[PDB]
Symmetry: D2
Subunit: 24 residues, 4 copies
């Protein structure tokens, strides 16, 4: 449910932070 | 580096939220 | 800019989690 | 309790990300 959708958002953010690390 | 460690923390939280969903 | 926008999103998720926690608590 | 503790952690990470964003900006 809701908490699963939030967990998916966190995993998407985790990928963004790793992309920022490796350039910006 | 730092941002990778934070991304790992977010992925660990995502797993906690999914565990909370499926019981608590 | 991007890190600041992600910081806002995480604070917003924290609010959302407290609302969920409360709804469960209340019920 | 647990969701509230995770909410605090996410707000703390948001602060940490703004500090990082700022350090990069400043440099
Ligand atoms: N995001
Ligand atoms: N946690
Ligand atoms: N969100
Ligand atoms: N943290």
């Amino acid at each position: 449910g809701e908490l699963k959708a939030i967990a998916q958002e966190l995993k998407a953010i985790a990928k963004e932070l790793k992309a920022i690390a490796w350039e910006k």
